Amino acid sequence: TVEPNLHSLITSTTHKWIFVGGKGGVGKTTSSCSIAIQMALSQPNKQFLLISTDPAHNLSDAFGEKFGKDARKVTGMNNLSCMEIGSIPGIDEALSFMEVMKHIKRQEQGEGETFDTVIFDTAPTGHTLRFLQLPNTLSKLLEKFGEITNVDISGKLNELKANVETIRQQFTDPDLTTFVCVCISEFLSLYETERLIQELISYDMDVNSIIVNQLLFAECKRCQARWKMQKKYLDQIDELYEDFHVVKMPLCAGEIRGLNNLTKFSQFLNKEYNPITDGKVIYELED
Amino acid sequence: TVEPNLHSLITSTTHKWIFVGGKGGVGKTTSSCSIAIQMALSQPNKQFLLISTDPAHNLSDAFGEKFGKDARKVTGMNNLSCMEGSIPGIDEALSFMEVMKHIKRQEQGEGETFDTVIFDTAPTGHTLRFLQLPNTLSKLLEKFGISGKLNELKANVETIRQQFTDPDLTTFVCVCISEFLSLYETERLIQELISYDMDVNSIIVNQLLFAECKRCQARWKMQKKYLDQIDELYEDFHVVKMPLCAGEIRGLNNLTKFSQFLNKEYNPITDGKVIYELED
Amino acid sequence: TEAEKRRLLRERRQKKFSNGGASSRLNKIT
Ligand SMILES: Nc1ncnc2c1ncn2[C@@H]1O[C@H](COP(=O)(O)OP(=O)(O)O)[C@@H](O)[C@H]1O
Ligand SMILES: Nc1ncnc2c1ncn2[C@@H]1O[C@H](COP(=O)(O)OP(=O)(O)O)[C@@H](O)[C@H]1O
Ligand SMILES: [Mg+2]
Ligand SMILES: [Mg+2]
Ligand SMILES: [Zn+2]
Numbered sequence: 001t002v003e004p005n006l007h008s009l010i011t012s013t014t015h016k017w018i019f020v021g022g023k024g025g026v027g028k029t030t031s032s033c034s035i036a037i038q039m040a041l042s043q044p045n046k047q048f049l050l051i052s053t054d055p056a057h058n059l060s061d062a063f064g065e066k067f068g069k070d071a072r073k074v075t076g077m078n079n080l081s082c083m084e085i086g087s088i089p090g091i092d093e094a095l096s097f098m099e100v101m102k103h104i105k106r107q108e109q110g111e112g113e114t115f116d117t118v119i120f121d122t123a124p125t126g127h128t129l130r131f132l133q134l135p136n137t138l139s140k141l142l143e144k145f146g147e148i149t150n151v152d153i154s155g156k157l158n159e160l161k162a163n164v165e166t167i168r169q170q171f172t173d174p175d176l177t178t179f180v181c182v183c184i185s186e187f188l189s190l191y192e193t194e195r196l197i198q199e200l201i202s203y204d205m206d207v208n209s210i211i212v213n214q215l216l217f218a219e220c221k222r223c224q225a226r227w228k229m230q231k232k233y234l235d236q237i238d239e240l241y242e243d244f245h246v247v248k249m250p251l252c253a254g255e256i257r258g259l260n261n262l263t264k265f266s267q268f269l270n271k272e273y274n275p276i277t278d279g280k281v282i283y284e285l286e287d
Numbered sequence: 288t289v290e291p292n293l294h295s296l297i298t299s300t301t302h303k304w305i306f307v308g309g310k311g312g313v314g315k316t317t318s319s320c321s322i323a324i325q326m327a328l329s330q331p332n333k334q335f336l337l338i339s340t341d342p343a344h345n346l347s348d349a350f351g352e353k354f355g356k357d358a359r360k361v362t363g364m365n366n367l368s369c370m371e372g373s374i375p376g377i378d379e380a381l382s383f384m385e386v387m388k389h390i391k392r393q394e395q396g397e398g399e400t401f402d403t404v405i406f407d408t409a410p411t412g413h414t415l416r417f418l419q420l421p422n423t424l425s426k427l428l429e430k431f432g433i434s435g436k437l438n439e440l441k442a443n444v445e446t447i448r449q450q451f452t453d454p455d456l457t458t459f460v461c462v463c464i465s466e467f468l469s470l471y472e473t474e475r476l477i478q479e480l481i482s483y484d485m486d487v488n489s490i491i492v493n494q495l496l497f498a499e500c501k502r503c504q505a506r507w508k509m510q511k512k513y514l515d516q517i518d519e520l521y522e523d524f525h526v527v528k529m530p531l532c533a534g535e536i537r538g539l540n541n542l543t544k545f546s547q548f549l550n551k552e553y554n555p556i557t558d559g560k561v562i563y564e565l566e567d
Numbered sequence: 568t569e570a571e572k573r574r575l576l577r578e579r580r581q582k583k584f585s586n587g588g589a590s591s592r593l594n595k596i597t
Contacts, residue, residue, distance in 0.1 A: 002576060023343060023410070025312015029468075055412070056310055056472050124310070125411035126342075174574065187535055191596070192343050198589060201581070208577055220500045222533040225566050229534035240592075243576035253502045254509030255467045286505050 004247045004272040006180065006209060010038040012117070017170075017177035021122030023192045027213050028182030029058045030256065032121035034266030035180065039117060040080035041263075046116035049104075051083040053123045059084050064257050071107045071115075076259045081115065083107070090131030094160065097128060101167075126196075132168065132203040135161035174206030180245075182211040185230035190237070209245040212237065217250060217275040247272055253286035261285040291527045291552045293460065293489060297325040299403075304450065304457035306415070308408030310472045314493050315462030316345045317536070319407035321546035322460065326403060327367035328543070333402035336390075338370040340409045346371050351537050358393045358401075363539045368401065376420025383415065384443060412476075418444055418451070419483045454486030460525075462491045465510035470517070489525040492517065497530060497555040527552055533566035541565040 009015065020035065022028035029052075036050035049071060052059050059082055060067040065074075071081045085103070108114045122129075138157055145153065170176050179200055183193035193210075200207050212234065218227040237246055250273045256265060265285060268278070296302065307322065309315035316339075323337035336358060339346045346369055347354040352362055354371045361367045370393070394400045408415075421444045428437055451457045459480055463473030473490075480487050492514065498507040517526055530553045536545060545565060548558070 002573070008573075025314075027312075056468075056475070058468060058472070061468055061471060123411070125409070174577070187537075188343075188345065188348055191348070192345075194593075194596075201584060206577060208573065218500065220498065220503050222563065222566060223500050223503060225563070226533040236596075243580045253506035257467065283502065283505065286502060 002243060003245060005270050006035065006038070006245060006247060007270045008245070009209070010042055010270060014175040015177065016117055018117070019120045019122060019127070019177070019179040020182065021127055021196065022182035023126055023196060024183060024189055026182050026184045026189055028211070029054070029062050029121060030262070031180070031182040031211055031213070032119060033059070033062060033262055034269050036080060036119040037263055037266045038269050039119070040077055043116075044079045047079050047081065047113055048117045048119065049081045049083065049115040050119040050121070051085060052121035053085065054121060056124070057084050059121065062257050063259065065259070071111060074259065090134040093128030094131040094134065094164070098163070129199065129203055132164065132205070135164050172204055177206070178209070179205055179207035180209040180211060181207070182213055184213050185215060185233035190233065209247065210237070210241065211247050211249060213249050214251045215248055219275065249273060250275065250282065252282050256285050289523055290525055292550050293322065293325070293525060293527060294550045295525070296489070297329055297550060301455040302457065303403055305403070306406045306408060306413070306457070306459040307462065308413055308476065309462035310412055310476060311463060311469055313462050313464045313469055315491070316341070316349050316407060317542070318460070318462040318491055318493070319346070319405060320349060320542055321549050323367055323405040324543055324546045325549050326405070327364055331366045334366050334368065334399055335403050335405065336368045336370065336401040337405040337407070339407035341407060343410070344371050346407065349537050350539065352539070358397060361539065376417025379414035380417035380420075380440070380443070416479065416483065418448055452484060457486070459485055459487035460489040460491060461487070462493055464493045465495060465513035470513065489527065490517070490521065491527050491529060493529050494531040495528055499555065529553060530555065530562065532562050536565045
């Protein structure tokens with residue numbers, strides 16, 4: 001029996017890389033936020049950074065405040081920045097990333113002030129993740145090419161492996177990096193979400209958290225009805241995730257943005273909201 | 288003042304290409320269905336075909352029946368099948384392109400042929416942006432002035448451009464709900480489309496409410512504050528309001544009996560009995 | 568060592584995954 005929250009993580013000190021996603025309009029965008037909020041608050045001596053590849057420019061949107069090609073400290077804080085931006089597999093995916101690295105380090109160096117923990121918003125298209133396996137399936141044929149030659153193709157391949165190992169070693173340590181995913185109480189979520197997890201493990205990636213969202217708590221007819229949906233489901237999860245941060249989360253009516261509204265939300269990423277108690281605070285962002 | 292439905296379209300005769308999308312888990316997947324349903328029903332002498340690129344294999348899923356690399360007539364009907372260089376535009380087209388052929392294989396090698404085709408733009412939006420892309424490649428072919436490839440692209444696009452560019456064989460419904468991020472983002476969609484000179488006449492708003500629980504009616508207002516937004520600025524549009532039946536809704540059964548409201552745009556007060564029917 | 572415990576839980580999940588049979592788990596869930 002483990003914890004429902006991400007408190008435990010809101011305060012990691014060795015996490016310089018967090019990946020958030022959730023195939024669906026399950027809402028993980030706000031996720032990507034309500035997390036990169038709880039962190040700075042409770043580690044303000046940490047310049048943090050939350051960015052997205054979702055072309056949609058959802059972040060700012062979800063923020064009622066515009067962001068772009070370069071790191072911009074949130075308006076309201078002083079430690080939480082935000083930044084919107086060969087036929088083989090994995091390829092593109094990596095580079096995609098890769099360039100990011102550099103494009104990011106520019107932004108800390110050329111900035112001066114540097115970032116501590118970095119928070120991702122895997123494209124609604126999921127993750128370019130693919131590429132971890134990269135240097136493996138590339139290990140077999142590296143030796144094939146070797147046996148025959150016994151220079152540029154070898155070069156690139158070794159570089160990729162290198163990079164991935166360096167990124168991978170830091171990356172394939174559950175302590176600087178790990179992977180929360182958002183997903184709600186419905187067949188297509190579950191399954192699909194579940195799927196997510198597999199590919200991740202398939203990348204040997206630590207991953208310990210689940211954010212279920214837009215729950216109900218009807219304690220109107222179709223409401224309570226609908227409610228049962230979710231419930232038939234919540235459990236499903238609970239049962240098969242004992243060892244998980246399966247974090248139930250409630251659903252405040254309609255739009256919810258404005259750093260104001262947002263912060264006062266994310267609190268429940270800590271003290272996992274309780275309907276009965278914390279039920280007052282809810283209708284607060286429902287106006 | 289035009290019509291809220293797609294009836295008018297459920298029966299196009301000259302539409303051999305329909306594009307449906309909606310950046311969001313706004314639900315357009317079922318859209319992609321509830322449409323490719325209303326068509327065959329009311330044009331059964333039309334072998335139709337609805338496919339998706341969404342890796343997720345959402346279709347079948349949303350169908351409680353599996354589909355795959357090749358055209359398979361729905362189970363329950365007899366005319367609605369289902370099937371799951373660094374420059375811009377590029378990939379996108381080809382992506383498509385190959386599809387063309389891969390599809391025509393499936394009609395020819397099939398024998399029986401398809402009449403109207405219905406798309407389910409990747410949750411990642413649309414990779415059809417390349418058409419916008421060829422005209423650029425043209426200006427700079429001249430700037431620079433290889434011929435083979437360029438003429439081929441033009442050709443393809445023209446077959447693709449015409450065809451798609453005539454508002455009569457092809458046009459573009461989009462799904463999207465009553466919330467800031469939808470709206471804006473959805474709105475955006477439209478622009479790029481126009482930016483592709485693509486006819487597009489229809490809007491499906493979804494998961495509406497109709498609270499006539501507290502947060503319900505509250506929430507309701509959300510949507511409402513919004514519905515209007517739309518109505519106002521869509522004088523001329525098929526802005527089709529649609530209601531929200533509780534929870535999972537699949538099984539060709541449940542589905543059909545849903546899509547009816549893509550015609551007789553559902554009315555809470557009247558058609559309100561039919562709703563809780565798929566809520567069990 | 569509260570942290571470690573978390574690692575053990577993760578690992579236990581992996582054993583369950585290696586041990587569990589994702590293909591089989593998927594089949595029952597389906
Ligand atoms: N628990 C919630 N209660 C109310 N609105 C929510 C909740 N979670 C997300 N939203 C709203 O739901 C919609 C989808 O959320 P979003 O974070 O954009 O999802 P994703 O990034 O996964 O696409 C947005 O309009 C957002 O404001
Ligand atoms: N009007 C509705 N009432 C109830 N459930 C719905 C409605 N529209 C869609 N759904 C459900 O909402 C979720 C998202 O719809 P889906 O068609 O998958 O969307 P999209 O394809 O845009 O991702 C699915 O679980 C689907 O069953
Ligand atoms: Mg998002
Ligand atoms: Mg879909
Ligand atoms: Zn309600």
